[PDB]
Each structure stands twice: as C-alpha cells, then as structure tokens.
C-alpha cells in the first residue's frame, strides 16, 4: 500500500518502540523512559 512514516514529520531520531519522532537523541531516551520501566510483553501469552 501507499504507506510509509516520512511526513508528518523529519526527524534524525525515531523510538524503535512506539514509533515517535525526536530532534535530538536527549528527547529519545527522556522518552524511553515510559518504555524501559513498565512489565514486559508476550507473544499470545497472558
Ligand atoms: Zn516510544
């Protein structure tokens, strides 16, 4: 399909988790944070 991220935004940085866009890697890992402190996932599982 026509799909694709480029466009509602250029960013250098991008979370690998969610999919946000950062200007600076700084920004990047003050995010991670929500991500690097929650219970982990599980493929079909719980
Ligand atoms: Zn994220």
């Not at 026509?2 to 979370?15: D, H, L, M, V």
């Not at 944070?33 to 599982?45: A, Y």
Request: net charge positive; aromatic share 6%.
């Amino acid at each position: 399909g026509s799909s694709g991220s480029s466009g509602t935004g250029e960013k250098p940085y991008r979370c690998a988790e969610c999919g946000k866009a950062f200007t600076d890697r700084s920004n990047l890992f003050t995010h991670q944070k929500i991500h690097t402190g929650e219970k982990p996932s599980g493929p079909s599982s719980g």
